[PDB]
């Protein structure tokens, strides 16, 4: 995150911290609790990854350096990419990981709510973007979970700013025209999580942007409103 605050502990208890094992652990993306065993997160995140074996999920955590070897995760069973899914900006930039095991949900680790088909009217006023990744093009993986608040920009908007790129209903951007605040490397399937009516909605997945928070650059999102039926298709098959 480019021009972000530490967050407070508990403050978005949907975030998780993907890390791969492979070749050495570290954090590989970001992702976002939306049922016990589901995890939202983009497609572009599992490129080489051959297996769900080097999978490790990390839920309530605040720092990365609460991850160590002795810190529980949850396991992967499954890697579900959209089958439409060629690359970030192409969009279908979503994927769903199924857990091994049940998170047990309570104070620091809970679920975010979908976006509702009649919400696709609603103009969301009071969103963030929450991630671990870089506070600019050339940096690291920071240790906090760092939060932003993003204004979201309309698609004829982001379509000027993308000259080259089609910008479909299915991606969302959000970001200032002057630039200073944006999602940046490693916060890719993290959320955008917008409150309405005192609920939190998880609005976007952080997918891709020209560079970090430039001038007239708005962050690249996934737009879960469109997506709601495939995620019900994959989370409640029979
Ligand atoms: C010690 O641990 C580390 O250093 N971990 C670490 C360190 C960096 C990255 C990963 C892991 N994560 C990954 O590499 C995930 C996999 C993957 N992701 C992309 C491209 C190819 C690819 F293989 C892409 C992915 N991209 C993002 O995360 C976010 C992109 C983005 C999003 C918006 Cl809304 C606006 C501007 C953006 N940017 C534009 N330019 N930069 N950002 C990425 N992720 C890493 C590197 N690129």
Known sequence: IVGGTASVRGEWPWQVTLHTT???????????????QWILTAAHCFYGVESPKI????????????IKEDTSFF?????????????????????LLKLETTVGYG???????????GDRNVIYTDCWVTGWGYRKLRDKIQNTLQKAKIPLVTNEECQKRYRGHKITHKM????????????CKGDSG??????????????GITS??????????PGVYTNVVEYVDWILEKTQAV
Do not use: F
Not at 77 to 91: F, P
Not at 109 to 116: A, G, K, T
Not at 172 to 183: F, S
């Open 22 to 36: 492979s070749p050495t652990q570290r954090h590989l993306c970001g992702g976002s609790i939306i049922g016990n």
């Open 55 to 66: 999978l490790r999920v990390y839920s309530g955590i605040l720092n990365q350096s609460e």
């Open 75 to 95: 396991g992967v069973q499954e890697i579900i990419i959209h089958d439409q899914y060629k690359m970030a900006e192409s969009g279908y930039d979503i994927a």
């Open 107 to 117: 104070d620091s680790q809970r679920p975010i709510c979908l976006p509702s088909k």
């Open 172 to 183: 969302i951007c959000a970001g200032y025209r002057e630039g200073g605040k944006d999602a």
């Open 190 to 203: 993290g959320p955008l999580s917008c409150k309405h009516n005192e609920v939190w909605h998880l609005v």
């Open 208 to 217: 891709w942007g020209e560079g970090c928070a430039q001038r007239e650059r």
